[PDB]
Design a protein around this ligand. Sequence first.
Ligand SMILES: [Ca+2]
Lengths: 56, 223
Amino acid sequence: RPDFCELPADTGPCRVRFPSFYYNPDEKKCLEFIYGGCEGNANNFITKEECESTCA
Amino acid sequence: IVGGYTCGANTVPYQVSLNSGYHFCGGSLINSQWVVSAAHCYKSGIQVRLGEDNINVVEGNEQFISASKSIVHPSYNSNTLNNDIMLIKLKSAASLNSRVASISLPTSCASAGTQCLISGWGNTKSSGTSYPDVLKCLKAPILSDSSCKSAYPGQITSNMFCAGYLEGGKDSCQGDSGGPVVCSGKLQGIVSWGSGCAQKNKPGVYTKVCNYVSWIKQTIASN
Ligand SMILES: [Ca+2]
């Protein structure tokens, strides 16, 4: 599983609403977060399925 | 909006919801056929929702109208968010009334310390996710350029200003982009960006609408 799965959720600076998922290592699952539409990091999935597949 | 209050239905009648399936951005009605929002809110196929209070329940005063054109500022820089302004033309003119009303454009820039009304359906939590059904409101002052530049070194252009509370607790947030900052009855700002929401020394950053009043007028005349 890639290193980015360890990165914290990063909404980025923009203030749009994009429902997203990130892998949380302390909870050993993919959780919802709100992505603002710009910047952020690679721990950012449109689907829970892909998040689990990649990081869980 | 974090740390705000419930506006009350249709008390901010120039506030619109931009909708591509769900609410994603706000905007401000500036006349019967045109809406000002942020360039970073651009999507093809936006539906504009006017007269909203509870965005999740049709209550009877709404007008949903498709966007016919969405025109991003020609100098919009998606990397620095410089010139973060967009004009949306409505497929058909809205029906203006007490619940659906335009907001005036500035005739001079606002100065630091001026109190503004910032509004939207964005996240209400500085740590967590909670979206409101109803429109939220926040009264916040414009901050000095030195405070804004100190918070965000090298990031603040002459087309941006900060508004909010350096002590934290009260801010716009994700879901509020493109919505209004109204000061003395004039549209002075558009919700643009910030570092987190309602964090200490990280105030909201807002497009400086007074720098675009000719562009708005010329774009309207041209389209
Ligand atoms: Ca409604």
